[PDB]
């Protein structure tokens, strides 16, 4: 089918498989999709048209974005259609 | 069918059922793999006790892509480097 869905993925920054390969600013960065289970991390799921990476300094632990996501949802709910 | 209970193949049948790891049974409607060519080919991959790349090479040799799609490429395979 044609068309595009504006899928927004808010993820904790500390769980991406490549902290590097993403430091480049305002430039295109290639990214691998093959997933290996000995890294104890997870790759970013492809075909998500927008990514928001939230960090609090930690690495390898969840819970770093639930507050941000909930606040963003609440603020969007206050926006006027 | 044989010489009554005076002579029986029950011990050898029980030994075969003790080695039932390789047995594959076809039955219409009751089980899956209703296609014989699907069932006869799954036995070679399963019973070889080979790793994933070996079975992938086997599927490449046989030029059967659906089997490697539905059997080899599933969750949790951990291919070597």
Swiss-Prot record, chain A:
It is found in: Cell membrane. It comes from the Eukaryota. Residues 59-81 are annotated as: Calmodulin-binding. Disulfide bonds: none annotated. Disruption phenotype: Trpm3-deficient mice exhibit clear deficits in their avoidance to noxious heat. Trpm3-deficient mice display reduced hypersensitivity to thermal, but not to mechanical, stimuli in carrageen-induced inflammatory pain. In the chronic constriction injury (CCI) model of neuropathic pain, intraperitoneal injection of isosakuranetin or primidone do not reduced heat sensitivity in Trpm3-deficient mice. Constitutively active, non-selective divalent cation-conducting channel that is permeable to Ca(2+), Mn(2+), and Mg(2+), with a high permeability for Ca(2+). However, can be enhanced by increasing temperature and by ligands, including the endogenous neurosteroid pregnenolone sulfate and sphingosine-1 and suppressed by intracellular Mg(2+). Implicated in a variety of cellular processes, including insulin/peptide secretion, vascular constriction and dilation, noxious heat sensing, inflammatory and spontaneous pain sensitivity. Homotetramer. Interacts with TRPM1; the interaction results in the formation of a heteromultimeric cation channel complex that are functionally different from the homomeric channels. Belongs to the transient receptor (TC 1.A.4) family. LTrpC subfamily. TRPM3 sub-subfamily. This is Transient receptor potential cation channel subfamily M member 3. It comes from Mus musculus (Mouse). The chain holds residues 242 to 322 of 1732 of the full protein.
């Amino acid at each position: 089918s044609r068309g595009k869905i504006c899928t927004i993925g808010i993820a904790p920054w500390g769980i991406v498989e490549n902290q590097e390969d993403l430091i480049g600013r305002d430039v295109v960065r290639p990214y691998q999709t093959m997933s290996n289970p000995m890294s104890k991390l997870t790759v970013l799921n492809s075909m998500h048209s927008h990514f928001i990476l939230a960090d609090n300094g930690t690495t390898g632990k969840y819970g770093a974005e639930v507050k941000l996501r909930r606040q963003l949802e609440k603020h969007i709910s206050l926006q006027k259609i | 069918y044989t010489r009554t209970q005076a002579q029986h193949l029950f011990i050898i049948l029980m030994e075969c059922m003790k080695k039932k790891e390789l047995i594959t049974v076809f039955r219409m409607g009751s089980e899956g793999h209703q296609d014989i060519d699907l069932a006869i080919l799954t036995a070679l991959l399963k019973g070889a006790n080979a790793s994933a790349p070996d079975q992938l090479s086997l599927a490449l040799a046989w030029n059967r892509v659906d089997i490697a799609r539905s059997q080899i490429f599933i969750y949790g395979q951990q291919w070597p480097v």
